[PDB]
Amino acid sequence: AREAIAQMKAAALAGINSRLFGLDGNISTNSENTERHTA
Amino acid sequence: AREAIAQMKAAALAGINSRLFGLDGNISTNSENTERHTA
Structure with missing residues (x-):
């Protein structure tokens, strides 16, 4: 399960540009x- | 028959790629x- 969790966290975050300001x-x-x- | 069953189960499953996601x-x-x- 340690693999599958990290796949979820990486799949659900892409394109979000932080841009702290x-x-x-x-x-x-x-x-x-x-x-x-x-x- | 214990041999023939296992031959069936193996013959009817090939190429199926699991891909849990x-x-x-x-x-x-x-x-x-x-x-x-x-x-």
Whole structure:
């Protein structure tokens, strides 16, 4: 049975790419403006 | 008759490859995407 177990564990895991990062929360698509308006 | 029986049992079994595994249900042809779309 020691063989058959390892065959199961290896058969049920393939293609799963770990990729320890998820996604970052910090977005900056465009920097902050910091300018004014007048008439 | 003890000889003839064993000849039958051996004659009627040949080429059958046991192969204790069948097929796995877990498929992963392509990993899961997890991305978005916008305009």
